[model samples]
Structure formats: structure tokens, C-alpha cells
Target: SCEIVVYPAQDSTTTNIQDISIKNYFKKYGEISHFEAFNDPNSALPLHVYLIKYANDAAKAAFSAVRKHESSGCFIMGFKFEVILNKHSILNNIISKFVEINVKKLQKLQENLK
Candidate 1:
């Protein structure tokens, strides 16, 4: 319940999203129980994904902040990214659609490379 997934708008390998930057950025939200960043292997693009678990009420507050500025964007290190509740919601649907598009785009690029 205290976990959320964060990902950049662009491929993470290209953006080079650092662990320190992610930790520093989310530290303001609350105490982080756990944090991990890795490339999503299921996708053709080497996309970096972040999994963050906040301690106690931090997750609640963080989710509120993200929802508050949902209209604009969550900017970290000058790159745009999305934060979605780890559970389920309409936002998750959007993430699914976005990932679906990225997979198709990357698949085409892979084909071109061959």
C-alpha cells in the first residue's frame, strides 16, 4: 500500500536517471522505506523504472501531492516522469497505454536496426 512506480517520459537508459537523484527528490515527500531502479526487461526499449516504498503516512501524502499537480507534470532533474499508485486506478490505465505505445515504437526501432 505504500509502494508506487515512477518512470520517465523517455527511455531511462538515454535519460540516465540516477538513484541518488530519485532518493533526494522523493525524500521531501516522506521517509522512504525502500527504493529500487531497474530497466524493464519486458519492453524493447531499455526503460528505467523506479519502485519506491514510503514509510507510514508518507505514501498517502506523496500520492496526494502527485494528484494535486497531475495536470502539469512531475519534473525530476529536468525530465518529466509519471508516478502511479502501485495498487490500481485510472492513472494505471494511462500508464498501460503509454507503455503499450512505447513497446510498439521500440519494436519498430529494433526491426530497423536489423
Candidate 2:
């Protein structure tokens, strides 16, 4: 019930996700809390990583869905989307940042009322 990153196949030139196709497929399982891509030269495959988050229950379902279809062509344009857990704790930090923003919003609202 956290974040996952999607990678394309090693043999393919698709370094990033195709918005229409990728989003279309993944959006079915849950609400996407966050979406982003990064270019990483340090990766084994010159991976363009996409970080995705979902609500708790939906995260399970989303993770289950990817695992369930491992080695299958359920992703965009017959591309194999490798869904992997985020080993780095950065996603958790992102959550905290979002929470902080919301708290700031509340403080601003209270100041307005005062």
C-alpha cells in the first residue's frame, strides 16, 4: 500500500511512459496519488522511471494487478511495464511533504478567520 516504479523492457527504446496508453491501463485499479518520471543513467537499462502511488486498499490491488500479470502484455502498446517497489524511502518523504502542505493550508485558513 505504497509507491511503485514502472520500467520499460530492456530491449526497447521506449525510455519513458506513453501518457495515453500507460495511464489508461494503470488508472483502472486505483486513484493515482502521484505520477512522475525520471531519467537515470545509473540504471542497468537507462531506465526512465515512473513513480506511482495509490490509496491503501487500492495500492494492494494495484500491486496485485501488476504481479498478477507478470510477463504479460497488459501495459501500453504491448510494452511490458515492470512494476517494482521503491527501495528508496523517498516516496514516504513525498507523503510527508504533501501532509506538510495541507497543514500549512489549514494554518492559513485559521489565520484568515482570525
Candidate 3:
């Protein structure tokens, strides 16, 4: 559930080198679970927004460390991108509850068979 929101300056046209560079940069931190890119709706200017989901906590931590160390932002493809943590506590709670319910049902089923 570890996710980060990245905002990168948009260019007039999408460049393959820039896209590949961004992916390679983040991969150095850790294994990425998912990566998505979209434009910022609020900004009138063209801005790219990336939603990155890391496979593990360590990956997310490492990514944050670089951001904090820079203090400005992570640089990739001649642009600085800001990184922010995306909290998924609500979704986690829902998943926990679902698992709890399933476990109780399984326990009850076992008891009935015994």
C-alpha cells in the first residue's frame, strides 16, 4: 500500500528518453509495484503527475530519503519532480475487516465439520 505522488514538469511533446529516464531513476530506490502517469487537472499549464506504488516499505523509504536529502526535489530528465506520500489507511482498514470476516467464517466452518 505504499504509494507516492510525483509531479514532473511537462514538455510540449512526450519524449521517450525522458519517460525512460524517470522510470530508471525511481527503480534505483526499490522494486516498483505500479507506475502511472497523467496530467494535472488543476493546473492550466501542462504538468505530469505520476502515481508510483512500491512493492515494499523499504523501497518507499529509500525514495523518500533521496527527496529529503535533495530538499528541492528529485531531478530526472532535466526536470525536478516533487514527491509526496499517499496514505492508504482507509483502504487498509477495509481489507483488514474483509480478511477478519473470512477468517471467522472459515473457523466456524471447521468447527461445524468437527
Measured against the true structure, the TM-scores of the candidates, in listed sequence, are 0.67, 0.57, 0.52
Expressed as tens digits, the lDDT of each residue in 1-114 for candidate 3 is: 366666533322243444456666777766776776653333322235556677636655545634663655576766666566655543233334334444565679889998
lDDT of 2 by residue, 2-112 (tens): 677666544234434455456556667677776765433222232344677666476685676457675563466666666766657754443343344445656798899
lDDT string for model 1 (1-114, tens) is 567777766543357667889877877777888887654346644345566778758768568635654677888877787777767653344456557667877789989999
Candidate that would win on TM-score: 1
TM-score of 2: 0.57
Q: Give candidate 1's whole-model lDDT.
A: 0.67
* Ranking of candidates on TM-score, top first: 1, 2, 3
- List the pairs of residues colliding in candidate 1: none
Q: Largest lDDT belongs to which candidate? A: 1
Worst 10 residues of 2 by lDDT: 39-48
Per-residue lDDT, model 1, residue 94, is 44
Better of 1 and 3 by TM-score: 1
Question: What residue runs in model 3 are displaced by over 4 Å at the alpha carbon?
Answer: 9-17, 40-46, 56-59, 62-68, 88-114
lDDT of 3 at 104: 62
RMSD in Å for all candidates = 4.0, 14.4, 16.4
